[PDB]
Amino acid sequence: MNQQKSLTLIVALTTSYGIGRSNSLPWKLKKEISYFKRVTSFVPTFDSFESMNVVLMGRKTWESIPLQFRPLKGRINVVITRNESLDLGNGIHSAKSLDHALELLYRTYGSESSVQINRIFVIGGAQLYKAAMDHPKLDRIMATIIYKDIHCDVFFPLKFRDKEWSSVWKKEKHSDLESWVGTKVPHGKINEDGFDYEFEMWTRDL
Ligand SMILES: NC(=O)c1ccc[n+]([C@@H]2O[C@H](COP(=O)([O-])OP(=O)(O)OC[C@H]3O[C@@H](n4cnc5c(N)ncnc54)[C@H](OP(=O)(O)O)[C@@H]3O)[C@@H](O)[C@H]2O)c1
Ligand SMILES: Nc1nc(=O)c2nc(CNc3ccc(C(=O)N[C@@H](CCC(=O)O)C(=O)O)cc3)cnc2[nH]1
């Protein structure tokens, strides 16, 4: 009814859990943003026919996307705002909260719809990340660890890779990361423009 499917969170963060600065990402990573686009766009071949993915984001995050890349193509976009004066879109939804968005999609993309939902992604920001970390359906984190203590003013809200959360959140093998995204992905450290980063997949039991 409200939430059938599992939620997946996607984030790029430093080893200090830093995620943004001055309403923007503090780094310019071309191969990294390409990975974001692949993961969030990927739907299996067979299901290719009707299925689409959803990207859920906080308003400040909506605002932070280059006018040029917005709305995010090939994906159903939904902005979470407790205050919707309006929304500047042409098939882009607004919802009051995370659950309100799930009900909107399940009502909007039912049987009368040509367009079916494949995967649901929470793309941030910190406020939305916090609500998703508390949601009983969030069981997967697609994280990119940036090994550089970049000055940030916004932080990921839960230290999921830390000892204290280690009996709940588990890092999965690289091969099932690849299997989940479909394409093979670079293993180990990637160096792009002075930054060292790596792709990880973390899961938890519901
Ligand atoms: N590194 C990454 O992977 C990554 C991913 C995303 C964002 N970021 C960065 O994070 C920053 C944006 O983060 P942020 O924390 O400031 O904001 P955010 O979550 O994008 O947006 C906050 C706004 O979203 C709405 N919202 C969020 N959670 C809500 C809830 N549970 N119920 C209702 N409304 C809710 C509210 O909108 P109203 O005020 O309209 O009520 C709140 O002001 C930027 O620097 C961005 O670049 C980094
Ligand atoms: N792994 C990861 N990396 C990120 O940079 C990221 N960013 C957000 C939020 N911020 C942004 C900022 C820009 C674009 C963006 O313009 N994306 C385009 C690709 C643009 C291009 O071709 O280079 C897209 O269509 O996905 C997306 C999200 C959320 N989760 C993330 N997750």
Structure determination method:
X-ray
Counting from 1 in the atom list of ligand 2, the atom nearest the Cα of 40 is: 26
Which phi and psi angles does 171 have, rounded to 5°? -85, 130
Indicate the resolution in Å. 1.9
Question: Could you list the residue range(s) of the whole structural domain that residue 192 is in?
Answer: 1-206
**Atom 3 (ligand 2) nearest CA:** 12
- Under a CB-based contact definition with an 8 Å cutoff, are residues 126 and 64 in contact? no
Distance 154 CA to ligand 1 centre (A): 10
List helix spans (H) across 147-191: 174-181
Counting from 1 in the atom list of ligand 2, the atom nearest the Cα of 32 is: 3
**69: Cβ below 6 Å to ligand 2?**
yes
List helix spans (H) across 109-197: 126-133, 174-181
What is the residue whose two structure tokens read 């280059």?
Answer: 66
List helix spans (H) across the chain: 30-41, 59-64, 98-108, 126-133, 174-181
Q: Which residues contact 187 (CB under 8 A, 6 or more apart)?
A: 174
**10: Cβ below 6 Å to ligand 2?**
yes
CATH number of residue 71's parent domain: 3.40.430.10
58: left (phi over 0), alpha (psi -120 to 50) or beta: beta
Q: 98-108 and 126-133 helices cross at what angle (nearest 10)?
A: 80
Distance 123 CA to ligand 2 centre (A): 9
Tokens of 145: 């660890």
Q: Which residues contact 114 (CB under 8 A, 6 or more apart)?
A: 50
- Structurally, the chain folds into a number of domains equal to 1
